[PDB]
Design a protein around this nucleic acid. Structure first.
Lengths: 35, 94, 62, 179, 272
RNA sequence: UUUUUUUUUUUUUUU
RNA sequence: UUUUUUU
RNA sequence: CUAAAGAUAGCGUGAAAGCUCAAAAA
RNA sequence: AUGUUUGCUUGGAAGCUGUAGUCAUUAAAAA
């Protein structure tokens, strides 16, 4: 499962919801939109 | 369908005044129409057609489909242009 | 007391093709994008509207 | 008249993996119905197993109908292929089932009109909902209207009788005038 | 011999009268329960649509925006959610009802009354919500196409169903041309007399034609065929003949984002 | 019922 | 410096 | 006392017996 | 509660190892 690397740590307040090297942002949206 | 290079033959025009059936009636000694009495609206509808620039689509005759069908999709992405009208012409009042 | 709304006598329905303009659409830059597309709209208009006072002014239906 | 329409046929053509479009509008079906809530892929084997379970639970006297068919093909990389050597062979077939689409439905109409105190039956759909890869919700739409309800009449009659009783009790004692 | 029996027999005539009177009283409203002479109109209030106001704002506020458009100027109104949805979803385990689009809404705005009928509805596929509902005016003497629903309440009294046969409702709604001041109520399919036949049994619209108004205000669509337009069936499960796929069938698995058919569908090697 | 959240750097939860 | 529970 | 009580919903036995629930009354 | 251990399988089947059916109680010094 996708839980080890640093490209999957959620944004906390004051980051813009798109920090450097993220994949989960586009994974969840896609999932919801259709898997 | 095939190409034609010549003057087309004469075509007779069609009238716009259909006939009607009547029958004698002794209760008034007069000829009464055989058609069933109806609302003016209905009469007009049947005769000329729907009143207005537009109307709702036609109903479904056949029973529903047991499974879903994407009937809301057109036949082609780009329909062809309209074809010209061909047929008997209307007769103008003399 | 409450009253039932009733349209003006002599009115008829009419389908305006192409589109209907406004203040905003008056501007060239604010015109329609596919200018040859069809955008019909059904509106109620008096038949008397289609009558020019001067012969030099006419109404092209198309 | 009734007919037994033949099911579609699988398309043996490689196709992209594009997204699942949304639904146009709500689909209304008489009788019981089972629908999804989210989009996902469903396999022909899954659908067939659901059909078999539904038939076994309901019995041979009841009738059922399917609303989704497996026609979308999908490819898979064979074991023993390099990084990229072209598209792989067809693996299985799936059906693009968006949210709100119906899967199964029983046109059967509840005959018990004067019995609104009993909820519908969804044991057959419960027996297969865990199987499905999507969340499902039970549904049962009928032609029953409010106006045509006996509950209202029962309520009315109870009220009337109460009133009558009360009136009688007040008049008996004679603490107030009549008429 | 017992006296209670005698007493009960003596009192029965009196008891009958009470039920008679109750039904009469019930019927009095119109100035049987399942009769065709029953009104179905509703009366609700509305609110004006303020300038510089979005759909979203109104929706969030707890209201449903609506507009009224034919035979008059375009008017904007807002109808309470708790008031509108209640009519819309009149079932505990149901979705958008058929009857919703078969009524006469007497909307009240300011000092004006509009007699309209919803045509266009924007509802959530899964959830029970209303986003936008359009209305169309109804003027006496003008043909109005309306879909009248059907009812089969009297299902218990079906010999066919009693014997264990399967019964279905083909047509949920029947098209009609309303000209009168009021819409006819829902039709009632009297299934009390429906015997099972080896091949099949069915009911047509000719039988139900007697339920129309006597004044002739309503009339079924001429396109229909009363001699062959069935409304209900009665057959045996797993005893139907085989038929081919209809020519007007469209595969829902090959639809584009735009609502168009895939290029593949145009191919030679594209069965069904 | 609400104020208290990934406050998951530590203490603290003092409502 | 907590709010709500129609008639 | 009056009223009501499914061809039989849940226990039980070896084929039985027995108990309880629904309905009814209060 | 009662007809009634109603019927066909079964060595045997009562409401309660399978299945079909699934209504009968208040009435003759009522006319």
């Amino acid at each position: 499962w996708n839980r080890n690397p640093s490209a999957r740590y959620p944004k906390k307040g004051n980051k813009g919801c798109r920090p450097v090297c993220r994949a989960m942002r586009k994974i969840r949206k896609r999932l919801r939109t259709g898997r | 369908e095939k190409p034609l290079f010549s003057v087309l033959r004469r075509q007779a025009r069609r009238n716009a005044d259909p006939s009607e059936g009547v029958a004698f009636c002794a209760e008034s000694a007069k000829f009464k129409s055989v058609r069933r009495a109806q609302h003016p609206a209905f009469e007009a509808f049947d005769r000329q057609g729907p009143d207005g620039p537009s109307q709702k689509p036609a109903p479904r005759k056949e029973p529903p489909l047991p499974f879903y069908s994407a009937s809301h999709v057109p036949n082609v992405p780009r329909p062809p242009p309209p074809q010209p009208y061909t047929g008997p012409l209307k007769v103008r009042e003399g | 007391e409450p009253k039932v709304y009733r349209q003006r006598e002599g009115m008829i329905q009419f389908v305006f093709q192409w589109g209907i303009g406004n203040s905003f659409r008056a501007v060239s830059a604010n015109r329609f994008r596919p200018v040859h597309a069809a955008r019909p709209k059904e509106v109620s208009i008096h038949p008397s509207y289609f009558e020019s006072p001067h012969p030099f002014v006419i109404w092209e239906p198309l | 008249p009734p007919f037994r329409f033949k099911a579609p046929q699988e398309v043996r053509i490689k196709v992209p993996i594009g997204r699942i479009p949304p639904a146009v509008g709500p689909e209304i079906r008489l009788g019981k119905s089972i629908v999804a809530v989210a989009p996902h892929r469903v396999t022909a084997e899954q659908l067939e197993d659901a059909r078999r379970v539904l038939r076994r639970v309901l019995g041979r006297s009841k009738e059922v109908h399917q609303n989704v068919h497996a026609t979308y093909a999908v490819t898979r990389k064979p074991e023993g292929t390099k990084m990229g050597q072209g598209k792989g062979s067809i693996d299985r077939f799936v059906a693009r089932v968006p949210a709100g689409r119906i899967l199964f439905h029983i046109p059967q109409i509840n005959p018990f009109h004067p019995f609104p105190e009993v909820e519908p039956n969804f044991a057959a759909f419960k027996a297969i909902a865990p199987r499905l890869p999507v969340p499902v919700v039970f549904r049962e739409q009928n032609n029953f209207f409010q106006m045509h309800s006996v509950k209202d009449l029962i309520r009315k009659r109870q009220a009337e009788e109460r009133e009558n009783r009360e009136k009688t009790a007040r008049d008996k004692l004679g603490g107030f005038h009549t008429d | 011999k017992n006296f209670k029996t005698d007493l009960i027999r003596m009192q029965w005539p009196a008891m009958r009268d009470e039920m008679v009177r109750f039904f009469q009283s019930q019927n009095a409203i119109a100035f049987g329960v399942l009769g065709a002479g029953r009104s179905s109109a509703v009366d609700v209030a509305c609110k004006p649509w303020k300038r510089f106001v979005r759909k979203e704002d109104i929706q969030r506020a707890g209201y449903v925006p609506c507009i009224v458009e034919k035979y008059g100027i375009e008017r904007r109104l807002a109808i309470h959610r708790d008031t509108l949805e209640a009519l819309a979803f009149d079932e505990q385990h149901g979705h958008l009802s058929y009857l919703f689009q078969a009524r006469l809404f007497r909307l009240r705005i300011g000092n004006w009354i509009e007699e309209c009928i919803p045509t266009f509805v924007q509802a959530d596929p899964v959830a029970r919500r209303l986003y936008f509902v359009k209305f169309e005016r109804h003027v006496a003497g003008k043909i109005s196409e309306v879909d009248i629903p059907t009812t089969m309440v009297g299902l218990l009294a079906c010999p066919a169903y009693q014997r264990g046969y399967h019964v279905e409702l083909v047509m949920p709604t029947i098209r009609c041309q309303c000209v009168g001041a009021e819409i006819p109520p829902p039709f009632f399919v009297d299934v009390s007399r429906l015997h099972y036949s080896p091949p099949y049994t069915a009911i047509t619209l000719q039988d139900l034609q007697h339920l129309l108004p006597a004044d002739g205000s309503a009339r079924f669509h001429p396109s229909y065929d009363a001699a062959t337009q069935e409304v209900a069936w009665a057959y045996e499960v797993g005893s139907l003949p085989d038929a081919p796929l209809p020519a007007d069938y469209v595969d829902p698995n090959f639809v584009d984002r735009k609502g168009q058919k895939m290029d593949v569908c145009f191919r030679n090697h594209f069965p069904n």
